[PDB]
Write a protein that binds this ligand. Structure first.
Ligand SMILES: *[C@@H]1O[C@H](CO[C@@H]2O[C@@H](C)[C@@H](O)[C@@H](O)[C@@H]2O)[C@@H](O[C@@H]2O[C@H](CO)[C@@H](O[C@@H]3O[C@H](CO[C@H]4O[C@H](CO)[C@@H](O)[C@H](O)[C@@H]4O[C@@H]4O[C@H](CO)[C@@H](O)[C@H](O)[C@H]4NC(C)=O)[C@@H](O)[C@H](O[C@H]4O[C@H](CO)[C@@H](O)[C@H](O)[C@@H]4O[C@@H]4O[C@H](CO)[C@@H](O[C@@H]5O[C@H](CO[C@]6(C(=O)O)C[C@H](O)[C@@H](NC(C)=O)[C@H]([C@H](O)[C@H](O)CO)O6)[C@H](O)[C@H](O)[C@H]5O)[C@H](O)[C@H]4NC(C)=O)[C@@H]3O)[C@H](O)[C@H]2NC(C)=O)[C@H](O)[C@H]1NC(C)=O
Lengths: 227, 206
């Protein structure tokens, strides 16, 4: 079987070149065609292009002006280069071994046939987020809440990098506390929510304060949350 | 999007009506997994793919590419895309379809959903965020859809991958970045969480 893995050197800021590598194992790149695919949240699963040693190589009309696919025989790697990257180029990129066949529906001499390409081996894909994100402290907002239970929380918004810590009432309140993993936003900044489930009847008696700490920017915020 | 009971047969159509001779490929995409080739050249099957999966012939002209999966089983629960090659249509650079197949016979736990509106504090900062917190679901696969009033919203949506909770169920959160104007103008916003064929909805109004 063959294995493929898509990877970047790292972080892509707007108006920088996106450089991706597809490491191939268990086979040589010279025996096959190769394709790059991507899934941008703004759009669907799109074919970027394919490459081959013979010079049989084509790119998507929408990306042809910015993309370069290359073959590195020495390193057995398939390369993707995308100039002038923006948030619109964010998403997940796939490398795949591409096969081909001929759909012959008439006489070959009459050009009554065409070549089709299909991908039988895909990589897991790598995520690419284009941004100028740098060290930034979080903004903290209260998430306000008859009978039954109630969910009150704190929205820790737009920080970088990970991670942040959250407690309630300086650790006096740990029951029903659920801190969710942060989302990586198109801005390149992170956001997470910490919600504590409490009895509605308690809304008057007890006082609720979330304690947020973000080391990278030396930020400490205590946000009181009420209804 | 379709839901099928184990043993029953699934039918997924993809792409436009056919104009010339075709070579249709079908691809399977499970959550957080590499896609796979299930069908190529309309009906042909790569090694490993069982005869349960079958494709439609490229005749007659005007047909729609249909993928049939008989006697469905849990493993066949995934997104199904087709890549159509038509002798009379220009080469396609975006894969078609995207239909999700849910299999119904599985052990599971429905998600709990809490939706928060933007805080008055954030609004004073001229920004707005809807927070949809999803917890206690199993298996760990959900799809989140947002509704501004009655119309779907694609822009502004950020959704985390499911993460394992301490009680071995799953959690996830979806955020809708929104301008205060968008927030006030609309009658309401909805977070729609679909899990194993069933959707749970929460709505907040400014
Ligand atoms: C692409 O992709 C792919 C895939 O992916 C996947 O899937 C998909 C679908 C999705 O979902 C995603 O998400 C995923 O991921 C990939 O691949 C992959 O990879 C990965 C990586 O991560 C991996 O993962 C893994 O998983 C596992 C599981 O497995 C299974 O499952 C899965 C799913 O889930 C799959 O996938 C696989 O495959 C499998 O499956 C299976 O298969 C088989 C065969 O075929 C069959 O048969 C079966 O059935 C199946 N099944 C099913 C399907 O179900 C898991 O498990 C793991 O986990 C782990 O690890 C991690 C990291 O990584 C962590 O985080 C966690 O936590 C875990 O861990 C562990 O834990 C445990 C508990 O605690 C432990 O145990 C313990 O231990 C202790 C001890 O310790 C110690 C001490 O002492 O302290 C420590 C230390 O450190 C040490 N030291 C040393 C030096 O070592 C020590 C020593 O050892 C001495 O001895 C001392 O003792 O130790 C105690 O003992 C106690 O008692 C106990 O309890 C342990 O430790 C730990 N471990 C570690 C290692 O850490 C993981 O997660 C997977 O697997 C894969 N998959 C595959 C298929 O392959 C890839 O990668 C991609 N690709 C590319 C190219 O890139």
């Amino acid at each position: 079987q063959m294995q493929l893995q898509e990877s970047g050197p790292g972080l892509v800021k707007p108006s920088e070149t996106l450089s991706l590598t597809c490491s191939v194992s268990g086979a040589s790149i010279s025996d096959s065609y190769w394709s790059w695919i991507r899934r941008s949240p703004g759009k669907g699963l799109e074919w970027i292009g394919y490459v081959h040693k013979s010079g049989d190589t084509n790119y998507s009309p929408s990306l042809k002006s910015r993309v370069n696919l290359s073959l590195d025989t020495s390193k057995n790697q398939v390369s993707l280069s995308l100039v002038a990257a923006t948030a619109a180029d964010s998403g997940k990129y796939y490398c795949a071994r591409t096969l081909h066949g001929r759909r012959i529906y008439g006489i070959v001499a009459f050009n009554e046939w065409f070549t089709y390409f299909y991908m039988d081996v895909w990589g897991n894909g790598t995520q690419v987020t284009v941004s100028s994100a740098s060290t930034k402290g979080p903004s903290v907002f209260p998430l306000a809440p008859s009978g039954g239970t109630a969910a009150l929380g704190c929205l820790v918004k737009d920080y970088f990098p990970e991670p942040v810590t959250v407690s309630w009432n300086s650790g006096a309140l740990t029951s029903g506390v659920h801190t969710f993993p942060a989302v990586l936003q198109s801005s390149g900044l992170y956001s997470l929510s910490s919600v504590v489930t409490v009895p509605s009847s308690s809304l008057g008696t007890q006082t609720y304060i979330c304690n947020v700490n973000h080391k990278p920017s030396n930020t400490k915020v205590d946000k009181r949350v009420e209804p | 999007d379709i839901s099928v009971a184990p043993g029953e047969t699934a039918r997924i159509s993809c792409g436009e009506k056919s104009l010339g001779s075709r070579a249709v490929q079908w691809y399977q995409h499970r959550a957080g997994q590499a896609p796979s080739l299930i069908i190529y050249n309309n009906q042909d099957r790569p090694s490993g793919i069982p005869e349960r999966f079958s494709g439609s012939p490229d005749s007659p002209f005007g047909t729609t590419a249909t993928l049939t999966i008989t006697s469905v089983e849990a493993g066949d629960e995934a997104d199904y895309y087709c890549h159509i090659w038509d002798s009379r249509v220009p080469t396609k650079w975006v894969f078609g379809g995207g239909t999700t197949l849910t299999v119904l016979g599985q052990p599971k736990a429905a998600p709990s959903v809490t939706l928060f509106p933007p805080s008055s504090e954030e609004l004073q900062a001229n920004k707005a965020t809807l927070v949809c917190l999803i917890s206690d679901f199993y298996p760990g696969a959900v799809t989140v859809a947002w509704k501004a009033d009655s119309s779907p919203v694609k822009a502004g949506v950020e959704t985390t991958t499911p993460s394992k909770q301490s009680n071995n169920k799953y959690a996830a959160s979806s955020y809708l970045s929104l301008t205060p104007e968008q927030w006030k103008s609309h009658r309401s916003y909805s977070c729609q969480v679909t899990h194993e064929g069933s959707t749970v909805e929460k709505t907040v109004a400014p």
